Each structure stands twice: as C-alpha cells, then as structure tokens.
Design a protein around this ligand. Structure first.
Ligand SMILES: NS(=O)(=O)c1ccc(NC(=O)Nc2cccc([N+](=O)[O-])c2)cc1
Ligand SMILES: [Zn+2]
Length: 257
C-alpha cells in the first residue's frame, strides 16, 4: 500500500487514487502576496473547553489523538464555515530535518512540522458521510517551528515511547488541545482535500498565520516513531508529508490585513 517512500510515496498515489490529480488538492503553497484579505470572513470560533480525548495511536503514517465526537463537545465554527464541525482527531506531519516537515508552505517556506486538527460537519451525521461531501470536513492547520518548547505538547511527547510501531495505541484521556494553539487565530482559507489517501476533496482548510514553537527535543521524539510494525525492519517515521499541489482554479483568502 501507500506510504511515503520512493516506491509508494506521493508521486505514486494517483494510480490508486486518481483524484490525486484533481481540481482541489491539498496541501498548497500559500503565496501571501496573492492571498486576498476578505473582510466578510467572520472570526474563528474554536470551542475546545469540553474536549474529551480517548486514545493515541500509531497508524503507520502518523500518530493520532482521537476524541469523543458523539456530542458537540469540541467544535469549530465561524470563519468561512457554515454550521458546526466536531473535532475527531489530530495528528502531525514532520520532517527528517528542521527545514522540512510541513505540508502547506508559506511563500515556499517549509516548516519543521504541521499539526492538523480534523473536524467534520455535523449536518452529515458521521465522518464517513462527511468525507463524501465538498463541505464535509474542516481541518485547522498549525505550523511548528523549532525553538522554545511547547508545554501543551509535552504530554503527547511523553507517551510516544509506548506507541513506537504501527498498530500500537494507548490511553490518552484528559488531554486539552487548547494547549497546542498559538496566540493569534488569524488564518488563511481555501477549499482543498485530505492530504493522505483517499485524498477526498471534502476539506475547508483553515491554516493559522502564527506558528507554534516546539523544542528540538520534542520534535526529535516525533522522529523516533516507526512506520513499521513491531518485529519488523525499523524505518523511522520521518518525512510523512505530501508536497504542495497545483492551486489551479482557487483563491486563498486571508482573515487578516
Ligand atoms: N492529513 S489531513 O488532510 O488533516 C486528513 C484528515 C483526515 C483524514 N481521514 C480521516 O480522518 N478518516 C477517519 C474516519 C473515521 C474515524 C477517524 N478517526 O477515528 O480519527 C478517521 C485523512 C487526512
Ligand atoms: Zn494531516
């Protein structure tokens, strides 16, 4: 199956998922001088006070923290969005080196990592229905640069030893995702897709202008994870990012001036 190596990586995905070459693929480069300020964009409403985390999981492509989405507990609304989107999971994409690790780029600049907080539109009832809809998902993207540690990330870093290999999961209750957010909620937005197979074109992307800083020790522990499962030849989980895709007939809008 698909992965991020030479023989199964992003250049191969279109053979199993021809939408890889579609009209609204993600990620993209954010050209800040070409994105237009849109005064009609409302502020984002990130309501994570009641968030209920469940498990942390190595899925062989990233690690993921899942949340209870059976009620409106942690929701995203406002911004470019209509209606209510429930937080389902977050995961990261990161590099083998600090100069690469993000999927979106900003004026071609690559960040060391990128956080994706994945939400689905409650009008569609369940995630599986939502991924079949052009407005089914909203993913909040947050860039990571290497500098000072991010305290709200350390509980995640602390547990990665226990999910080293594909298929491992662990209890990860009572985690507060508000500690992963930067100060400003200024954002860029555009219509796009999942950045992993099936690459469904179901995502309103909301990418925050302000990166969070993480320490070298924190991102180092990302790079200790493995793509393989236990008892297999070790391949470090690094460079699990899809490169920027053609913007095609799309406008990136900015919530700020
Ligand atoms: N890398 S990304 O563009 O932010 C992305 C987000 C979501 C998916 N797909 C899913 O999350 N599917 C899914 C469907 C049901 C339940 C869960 N989950 O337990 O996290 C996940 C793929 C790529
Ligand atoms: Zn992602």
């Amino acid at each position: 199956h698909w992965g991020y190596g030479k023989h199964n990586g992003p250049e191969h995905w279109h053979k199993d998922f021809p939408i890889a070459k579609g009209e609204r693929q993600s990620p993209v480069d954010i050209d800040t001088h070409t994105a237009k300020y849109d005064p009609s964009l409302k502020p984002l409403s990130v309501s994570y006070d009641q968030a209920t985390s469940l498990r942390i999981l190595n899925n062989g492509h990233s690690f993921q923290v899942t949340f209870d989405d059976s009620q409106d507990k942690a929701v995203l609304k406002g911004g470019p969005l209509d209606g209510t989107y429930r937080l389902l999971q977050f995961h990261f994409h990161w590099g083998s080196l600090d100069g690469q690790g993000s999927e979106h780029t900003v004026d071609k600049k690559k960040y060391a990592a990128e956080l994706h907080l994945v939400h689905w539109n409650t009008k569609y009832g369940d995630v599986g229905k939502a991924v079949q809809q052009p407005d089914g998902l909203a993913v909040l993207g947050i860039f990571l640069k290497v500098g000072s540690a991010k305290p709200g990330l350390q509980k995640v870093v602390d547990v990665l030893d226990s999910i080293k290999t594909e298929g491992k999961s662990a209890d990860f209750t009572n985690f507060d995702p508000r500690g992963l957010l930067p100060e400003s909620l200024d954002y860029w937005t555009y219509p796009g897709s999942l950045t992993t197979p099936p690459l469904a074109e179901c995502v309103t992307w909301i990418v925050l202008k302000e990166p969070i800083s993480v320490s070298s020790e924190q991102v180092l522990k990302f790079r200790k994870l493995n793509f393989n499962g236990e008892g297999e030849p070790e391949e470090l989980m690094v460079d699990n990012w899809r490169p920027a895709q053609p913007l095609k007939n799309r406008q990136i809008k900015a919530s700020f001036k």
